[PDB]
Design a protein around this nucleic acid. Structure first.
Ligand code: ANP
Ligand code: ANP
Ligand code: MG
Ligand code: MG
Ligand code: ZN
Lengths: 620, 598, 227
DNA sequence: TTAGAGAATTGGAGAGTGTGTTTTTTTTTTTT
DNA sequence: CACACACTCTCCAATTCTCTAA
């Protein structure tokens, strides 16, 4: 009875035509785009009505139905017929929610019926299924049509309606359902898990169930790091005539943001200002790790990648670049993997002893929303159009590497389990790290015996690097100097004797608030990590094309490499040069062209790519 | 709102009055003609096109697309009411006798109507079938993952009463129903006669019913997602159009499955869905003179994989593999090499060219193996056999990469195929035999590194001789540097990357459809050997065995191999008797395959 | 079975030793007249992190006095004669270095890993049994009694839900503490391989049964072995 | 004396109410 | 939950008891 005042407040807030026109413009954009939820910033609601903002965040359900009714009134005033074209117009909330910013761990029972913004990683999603909200029925015996609304505990009003349809009797006559005139909404359930690094000590990551409706269902898949704004509620699990107090709790989402996914003109100017920007990016790739320049260049090529061809005959040429690092203990292989996991979009960690062929590809699991079993994606399927980092790769079982073979060879994985027979897309770059046999590389043995992997598997990697703990005194001097400098570093936003805090939630707005070189050092103008992330994100899309001169030089130098294999030492060749090496040359030249943002693979790209191949094939 | 009686009258008007000038301007009333055919029972299914409906009422097309089930019923009722105007087996007999009793509309209805979807509607993917499209006519593309056998679905049940001799009828809509027990007729109820009802399967209307499951095309799925699936329920003449592994586009109504009883309270307002299928669509003498040119053998060998230079005699052997010998008959061959030697590329070409084929790895695949496998489909829980590379390749050729890396189960399965061309598999502890007569095209690696000719093939490739001797030809695709050929190969690869196509080769490959026609009519020829050529076979075989003994993988299977290859070349020549050139070709192909191995 | 309520939730974690004050009672939803029993907790006492100011003054005095290093070394395993340098190494292990997160996001471990190879009957196992007792978080394992899953993490099907769930091994149970692996040489090679990520990167990356995560293993490995 | 019409007693038919409903990881022993 | 066991409860009517005529 009292909610008309709140509805008046929200309608007054939405009618921005008087002062700034922000939200009337947003509603107009909603009408033009044919959407039916408005994205409202609670910061603006605070600026115009602090009282109503506090009430909204602390009394979420009643306030939200008031807000949605006000939005329906406003969109009707702007365009009445469009207001009739949808059952109801939702509102999704963004901005800063104060103390309501939580994780799945800190989302305790005291947050019930409040708007909360939960940050976490998606572990699983149920299949989208329709949900009836209003069913229309027709009586042939009466030539009359009737309607019934439907609600359940998930809906904001939360009354449980009877599940069944009117069936054989209205006016004691048989009805039949008008499915077309009825209206259904999409329904999906996901599970948001705590960020694994932020758990306290030995506690495993906790999780919270989330319910998506209508247009939100597409906006999250497993492995995504998301921020979900919604209302927290308990669902009573009555037996019928009896219940235990234990109720499961869910988050009915009103808005979902991909917090890790995501201006170009300054990048396209920087590629002109800089001289051979590939070198600067490669040097600035992992600042904490000294040396390994060619490996860093190869990793940058892996990050950028070639362009995947589709041929007129329907065959396709795989565009991803696969790198295998083999080397002694303590030569930063694991650290290079960790940097790639931090810097790249959708990079999946994996280690040889802690993974299985099932977990790498797909597993049959029961969806508890229904009980039916479905495929749940493994590591390389999650890594599609991304990277997968495999540490301790020499420690995998052969049956587990059978899974990797198809992924690397064809960019897919074939599955035949449960009721499903399917070719899943697993188009990912593999960055594998391994130790040689006997732990430490043996100079008195051939590379094919230091490398315990089979030649069939090794053929699938574009580049194979052997990196050794050579105890040269000058190299040791520079390495130790860099290591001790890194260990001496302390951040500016940290006191002089602090131990760094164990993880806790520190994100307090749905969008980042502080919105290219490093400033400390003089030599070579090191690039910052954020700019490198943005530049790689832009440069991956350029898609350059071969030129006649670069093609000619690649062919000539490949022929030289092949003919050089005639007299090259069979006892010490890293890997045999073949057409696969030529594919590697083309992909690396394309990646260098992407780094330059050139749109044409030039002779410079060919020169750098074939230099990298020469180093990887004929240098330790 | 809608006045469905007026809609029915407008539908009658459309059916009566539409014409489309078919058969080059004859001004045919297509729907009147089909109404005559339905009335005469010479036709049962009527696919009305909403593109035709659009040409006189777009609003009616919109109403159909928005409320498809209602308008399906209205169109069917209008057609049934109009059949007497155009009316110039067992259920027919029953309808005749019920007309005699008159002298249950759904029972007397002996036709079916479907909407062929309008071209303005784009064909969706399965993932794009949102909840807003429930109860609406949608067009969906996908791969047919699995199809059930055709089963009878009760449409109108018919009962007879023992005491009062009266027929009673029970129309069926839901997937489940209550069968009637006691007689409802007033002469039974008022007399309290205790009469009961017996179902008459003979005099009750069934319909063909088939359940299948579509699945997203793999190259249309979003990046990080499992392909989605949709259950499709198929009725009447739409049944048996689809098969597993087929690519289809289905026009149908997206509807919810309304379960009964305990599942209702469990599921609540949620519901599973199915697609009610209305339409399923599936995605030379001059040429014989070109074939007549005596170059045709080498012309075809050149047309085989111009992307690969050399190995022309291997290409000829591959041609004879696709041709096959006299019916035994499969020319199984094996070609070993190092990784990356263009061996996989050659096998991929044969898989693309061949009409029935498969391409797989000997190892360890997480998919269905070389043998078929039994899936569970746990929403139903009914275990069903599916796939198997050998089974899917049955009448054709199965290509196996890294044959050396096969498991022992796979090796025994291929051994069984080589022996008797069928395999054994268990569904639910019980087991069956499953048929596969495919030719095997095997590619294998050395056990370690590049091939060394100083070591024998079985010791190098690490395969048992019991399997390795089965193949008629053994080739070794060795790769070594060669400056000009490497440069030519590099120019080819660079052009392929630069233009996404093969460069011009100073000749035109024959069309693969024409090659398929050629090998088909070739395989339809059935040669036989004369006795003089048998003597020639004997002399050539004994001399070849002298050479093999002096340098041992020659036996009676060698004589049978050269006979198979000679009959294959006789088929290639398209003549029903072999000749000296056939035996010469077989002998030299075997000899030079051994030379390639040496 | 215990039932914790309101502010008793998350007052204790697995591996802790507690005294529980509560009400022994039946659950109230083989045989007929049987009811399952549990304790309704109303008081938790950790028998052994919020220090009192008096304790903080004592700790500051201990840090301030000049011979605290020798005092700690003498305090470690006082029943064990000799081995003073090994006790000093154990002191360094117990206090540990400083974890550091560098500008590019790479993290360096502060934990110190200490192996004690040597002759039998030399108090190595007793030093491990002291460190398990003395460390704020401490887990004692026998190498021969351990497995790769049991050390790092196990994936098992939840019986009541049919999902696959994670279970913390010794290195997860000891996160923020010390793992005492006694008779370390008796492990099979494939099981010693499992701890390589957790010893250096201090993480346990898992990809099994469709669940894919990176658990934390910020712990020190103290190992004992014979020749 | 024997048989049919009006009144009294008890069986049970029917309505209402309450209740019941293969597929992955990890271990262990033995097979080679 | 909507479709089946098991039990209670209500009023209809089926058969006998008693009075009268043939
Ligand atoms: N060139 C280097 N610059 C900086 N730190 C380095 C360098 N080489 C090794 N380190 C350090 O050595 C430690 C071990 O690095 P890590 O990546 O595990 O080496 P690794 O090559 O993977 N050896 P392993 O894991 O035993 O196969 C880390 O703290 C690195 O930072
Ligand atoms: N220096 C010592 N001071 C006191 N007790 C000692 C000393 N050395 C050995 N012991 C005792 O010897 C017994 C065995 O000690 P233990 O801890 O097993 O040594 P250990 O080297 O680990 N044995 P092992 O497992 O065979 O290598 C215990 O009772 C110890 O207390
Ligand atoms: Mg490492
Ligand atoms: Mg010991
Ligand atoms: Zn009857």
């Amino acid at each position: 009875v009292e909610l008309r005042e709140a509805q008046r407040d929200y309608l007054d807030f939405l009618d921005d035509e008087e002062d700034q026109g922000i939200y009337q413009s947003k509603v107009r954009e909603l009408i033009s785009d044919n959407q039916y939820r408005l994205i409202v910033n609670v910061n603006d609601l605070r600026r115009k009505n602090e009282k109503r903002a506090n009430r909204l965040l602390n009394n979420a359900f009643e306030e939200l139905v008031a807000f949605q009714r006000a939005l329906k009134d406003f969109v009707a005033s702007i365009d009445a017929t469009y207001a009739k074209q949808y059952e109801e117009f939702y509102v999704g909330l963004e901005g800063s929610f104060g103390s309501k910013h939580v994780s799945p761990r800190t989302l305790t029972s005291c947050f019930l019926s409040c708007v909360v913004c939960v940050e976490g990683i998606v572990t699983k999603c149920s299949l989208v299924r329709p949900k009836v909200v209003r069913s229309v029925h027709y009586c042939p015996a009466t030539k009359k049509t009737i309607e019934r609304r439907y609600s359940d505990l998930t809906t904001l009003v939360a009354f449980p309606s009877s599940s069944v349809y009117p069936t054989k009797d209205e006016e004691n006559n048989p009805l039949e359902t008008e499915y077309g005139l009825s209206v259904y909404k999409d329904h999906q359930t996901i599970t948001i898990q705590e960020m694994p690094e932020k758990a306290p000590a030995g506690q495993l990551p906790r999780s919270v169930d989330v319910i998506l409706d209508d247009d939100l269902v597409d906006k999250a898949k497993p492995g995504d790091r998301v921020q979900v704004v919604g209302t927290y509620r308990c669902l009573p699990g009555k037996k019928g005539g009896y219940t235990s107090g234990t109720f499961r709790t869910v988050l009915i989402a009103c808005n979902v943001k991909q917090m890790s996914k995501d201006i170009a003109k300054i990048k396209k100017f920087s590629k002109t200002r800089s001289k051979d920007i590939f070198d600067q990016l490669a040097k600035s790739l992992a600042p904490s790790i000294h040396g390994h320049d060619y490996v860093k260049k190869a990793i940058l090529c892996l990050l950028l990648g070639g362009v995947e061809r589709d041929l007129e005959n329907g065959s396709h040429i795989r565009g991803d670049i696969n790198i295998l690092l083999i080397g002694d203990p303590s030569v930063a292989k694991s650290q290079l993997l960790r940097y790639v996991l931090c810097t790249a979009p959708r990079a999946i960690p994996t280690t040889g002893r802690g993974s299985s062929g099932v977990g790498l590809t797909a597993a049959v699991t029961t969806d508890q929303e229904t009980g039916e079993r479905r495929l749940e994606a493994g590591a390389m399927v999650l890594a599609d159009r991304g990277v997968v980092c495999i540490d301790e790769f020499d420690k995998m079982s052969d049956m587990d590497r059978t899974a990797i073979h198809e992924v690397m060879e064809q960019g897919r994985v074939t599955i035949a389990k449960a009721g499903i027979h399917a070719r899943l897309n697993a188009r990912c770059s593999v960055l594998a790290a391994a130790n040689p046999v006997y732990g430490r590389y043996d100079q008195y043995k051939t590379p094919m015996e230091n490398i315990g992997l089979q030649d069939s598997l090794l053929s699938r990697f574009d580049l194979l690097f052997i990196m050794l703990d050579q105890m040269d005194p000058e190299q040791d001097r520079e390495i130790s100097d860099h290591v001790l400098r890194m260990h001496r570093y302390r951040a500016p936003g940290e006191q002089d004797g602090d131990a760094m805090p164990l993880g806790s939630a520190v994100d307090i707005l749905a969008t980042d608030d502080p919105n290219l070189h490093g400033t400390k050092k003089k030599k070579e103008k090191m690039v910052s990590a954020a700019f490198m992330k943005k530049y790689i994100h832009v440069a991956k899309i350029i898609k350059p094309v071969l030129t006649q001169e670069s093609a000619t030089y690649i062919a000539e130098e490949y022929s030289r490499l092949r003919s050089q294999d005639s007299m090259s030492s069979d006892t010490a060749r890293t890997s045999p040069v073949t057409a696969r090496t030529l594919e590697t040359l083309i992909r690396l030249a394309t990646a260098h062209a992407k780094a330059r943002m050139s749109k044409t693979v030039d002779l410079q790209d060919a020169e750098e790519a074939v230099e990298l191949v020469q180093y990887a094939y004929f240098k330790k | 709102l809608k006045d469905y009686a007026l809609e029915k009258e407008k539908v009658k008007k459309f059916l009566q009055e539409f014409y489309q000038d078919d058969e080059l301007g004859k001004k045919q009333f297509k729907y009147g003609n089909q109404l005559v055919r339905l009335a005469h029972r010479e036709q049962v299914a009527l696919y009305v096109d909403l593109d035709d409906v659009a040409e006189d009422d777009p609003e009616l097309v919109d109403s159909i697309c928005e409320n498809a089930r209602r308008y399906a019923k209205l169109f069917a009722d209008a057609v049934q009411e109009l059949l007497p105007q155009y009316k110039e087996d067992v259920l027919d007999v029953y309808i005749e006798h019920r007309l005699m009793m008159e002298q249950p509309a759904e029972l007397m209805r002996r036709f079916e109507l479907y909407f062929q979807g309008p071209s303005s509607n784009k064909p969706r993917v399965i993932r794009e079938v949102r909840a807003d499209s429930v109860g609406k006519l949608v067009t969906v593309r996908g791969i047919v993952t699995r199809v059930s056998e055709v089963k009878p679905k009760m449409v109108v049940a018919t009962y007879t009463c023992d005491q009062c001799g009266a027929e009673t009828y029970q129309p069926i809509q839901s997937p489940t129903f209550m069968p009637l027990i006691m007689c409802p007729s007033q002469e039974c109820q008022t007399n309290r006669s205790g009469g009961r009802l017996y179902l008459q399967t003979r005099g009750s209307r069934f319909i063909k019913f088939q359940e299948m499951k579509m699945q997203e095309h793999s190259d249309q799925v979003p990046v990080g997602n499992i392909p989605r699936s949709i259950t499709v329920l198929v009725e009447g003449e739409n049944t048996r159009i689809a098969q597993p592994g087929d690519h289809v586009s289905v026009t149908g109504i997206f509807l919810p499955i309304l379960r009964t009883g305990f599942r209702q309270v469990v599921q609540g307002l949620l519901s599973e869905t199915y697609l009610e299928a209305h339409r399923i669509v599936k995605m030379t003498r001059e040429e014989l003179r070109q074939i007549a040119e005596e170059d045709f053998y080498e012309k075809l060998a050149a047309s085989i994989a111009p992307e690969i230079y050399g190995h022309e005699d291997v290409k000829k052997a591959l041609l004879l593999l696709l041709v096959g010998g006299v019916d035994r008959g499969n020319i199984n061959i094996c070609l070993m090499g190092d990784p990356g030697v263009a061996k996989s590329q050659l096998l991929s070409y044969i898989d693309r060219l061949a009409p029935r084929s498969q391409y797989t790895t000997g190892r360890g695949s997480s998919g269905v193996g070389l043998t078929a496998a039994v899936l569970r489909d746990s929403v139903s829980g009914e275990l069903t056999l599916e796939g198997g590379a050998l089974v899917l390749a049955d009448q054709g050729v199965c290509c196996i990469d890294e044959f050396d890396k096969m498991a022992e189960a796979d090796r025994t399965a291929i051994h069984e195929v080589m022996e008797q061309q069928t395999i054994s598999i268990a569904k639910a502890g019980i087991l069956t035999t499953l048929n596969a007569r495919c030719s095997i095209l095997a590619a294998a690696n050395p056990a370690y590194g590049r091939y060394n000719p100083r070591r024998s093939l079985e010791q190098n490739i690490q395969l048992p001789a019991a399997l390795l001797s089965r193949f008629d030809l053994l080739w070794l695709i060795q790769d070594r540097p060669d400056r000009d050929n490497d440069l030519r190969l590099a120019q080819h690869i660079t052009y392929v990357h630069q233009h996404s196509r093969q460069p011009p080769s100073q000749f035109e490959p024959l069309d693969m459809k024409l090659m398929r026609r050629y090998i088909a009519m070739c395989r339809e020829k059935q040669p036989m050997v004369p006795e003089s050529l048998a003597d020639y076979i004997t002399a050539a075989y004994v001399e070849m065995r002298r050479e093999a003994w002096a340098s041992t993988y020659t036996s009676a299977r060698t004589l049978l191999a050269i006979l198979r290859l000679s009959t294959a070349l006789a088929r290639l020549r398209m003549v029903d008797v072999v000749e000296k050139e056939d035996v010469n070709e077989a002998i030299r192909l075997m000899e030079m395959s051994k030379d390639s191995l040496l | 079975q215990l039932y914790c309520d309101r502010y008793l939730c998350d007052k204790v974690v697995p591996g802790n030793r507690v005294t529980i004050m509560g009400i022994y009672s039946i659950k109230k939803f083989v045989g007929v007249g049987i009811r399952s029993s549990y304790i309704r907790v109303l008081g938790i006492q950790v028998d052994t992190g919020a220090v009192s100011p008096q304790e903080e003054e004592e700790f500051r005095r201990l840090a301030a006095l000049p011979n605290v290093y020798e005092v700690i070394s003498k305090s470690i395993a006082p029943s064990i004669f000799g081995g003073t340098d090994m006790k000093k190494a154990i002191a360094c292990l117990l206090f540990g270095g400083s974890r550091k997160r560098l500008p590019d996001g790479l993290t360096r471990r502060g934990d110190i890993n200490l192996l004690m190879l040597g002759d039998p009957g030399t108090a190595k196992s007793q030093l491990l049994k002291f460190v398990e007792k003395c460390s704020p978080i401490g887990v004692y394992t026998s190498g021969k009694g351990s497995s790769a899953a049991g050390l790092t993490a196990s994936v098992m099907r939840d019986p009541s839900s049919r999902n696959f769930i994670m279970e913390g091994g010794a290195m997860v149970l000891a996160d923020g503490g010390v793992v005492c692996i006694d008779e370390f040489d008796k492990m099979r090679e494939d099981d010693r391989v499992a701890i390589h990520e957790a010893m250096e990167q201090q993480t346990i990356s898992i990809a099994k049964a469709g669940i894919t995560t990176t658990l934390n293993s910020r712990c020190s490995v103290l190992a004992a072995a014979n020749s």
